[PDB]
Ligand SMILES: CN(Cc1ccc2nccnc2c1)C(=O)c1ccc(N(Cc2ccccc2)C(=O)c2ccc(O)cc2O)cc1
Ligand SMILES: CC(C)c1ccc(COc2ccc(CC(=O)NCCN)cc2Cl)cc1
Ligand SMILES: [Cl-]
Ligand SMILES: [Cl-]
């Protein structure tokens with residue numbers, strides 16, 4: 398077949414990062430034809446760029462069942478999208494069977510994450526868990542997952558618009574605190590269920606420019622929830638477990654600061670912290686892979702990719718003996734929120 402040729406062709410192109418503006422302008426609808434003509438080019442670009450990177454992996458990794466699996470998915474998905482390169486954007490069936498095609502692709506790729514996890518696992522027992530294996534896994538998975546996040550963003554934007562207020566997965570009016578409370582309510586629910594004690598939540602807002610206004614932004618709230626949800630899980634585990642032979646359960650304090658470009662979200666706990674040495678391993682896919690509420694692999698690094706994805710970040714610093722702070726940094730301004738795609 399043609400796969401390695403297509404890979405070859407489209408991996409000469411560079412994925413085109415979009416900004417929230419451009420994202421918003423894509424269904425504000427009837428320029429679905431325009432989403433179609435765009436996506437039939439750009440998915441193959443993006444699919445191919447990562448596919449080529451998968452190929453640069455040494456044979457001992459690439460030859461493993463897990464990788465060969467997801468690689469087979471990427472090939473089929475690229476083929477699936479190929480069928481439409483000739484097709485004409487004015488035939489309303491051309492269009493609606495592209496949607497199906499995108500939907501089907503998105504389901505095909507669902508289990509990528511625990512699949513790669515299995516490859517890491519096999520690799521760990523099969524070749525060792527040395528620092529250098531670890532930089533390498535990290536390097537590849539941070540890019541891959543990031544790649545994949547951006548592919549999904551594209552598919553979801555398309556399928557959700559072409560079945561106001563919300564534009565696909567973008568809320569142009571996301572109330573950050575609203576999303577915080579939700580993630581907290583849900584983490585508490587699970588925290589209550591497994592621990593039978595859950596810390597309270599305290600939120601403070603700091604709108605620097607407008608003392609009064611509630612903090613709203615343009616974002617992808619499911620993205621934000623995911624990140625918050627994961628940080629809640631962790632801060633809850635730590636809070637509860639560090640205090641089981643003690644009466645008070647200190648609340649989890651979250652602050653939302655809106656600056657001139659940063660919108661920053663800090664989740665501070667009193668869980669007794671982590672010493673500085675063990676902080677880098679928390680983001681390591683490898684060290685957080687192994688054969689409840691947490692101990693539950695990948696949430697941190699993936700949450701951090703989520704933040705990186707529109708030029709944000711996610712950092713942890715801890716005080717051993719006291720607790721951990723966790724900061725999600727996001728762009729305040731739609732203008733500054735541009736996709737961040739792995740290089741190639
Ligand atoms: C428990 N998980 C999930 C996880 C997932 C895969 C793993 N894989 C291997 C080992 N541990 C894993 C843990 C955590 O990441 C996690 C790690 C460290 C903390 N701890 C330390 C701690 C304190 C008391 C009791 C237990 C732990 C933290 O300080 C901490 C870390 C991140 C965070 O957002 C908040 C925190 O409070 C809290 C949570
Ligand atoms: C399953 C997926 C996540 C996975 C699992 C495991 C890995 C591991 O990847 C490694 C490990 C060691 C080396 C050293 C090497 O060969 N150096 C060459 C010397 N110049 C290179 C790579 Cl790409 C990647 C991806
Ligand atoms: Cl990255
Ligand atoms: Cl789109």
Ligand SMILES: [Cl-]
Pocket residue numbers: 712713714
């Ligand atoms: Cl850090």
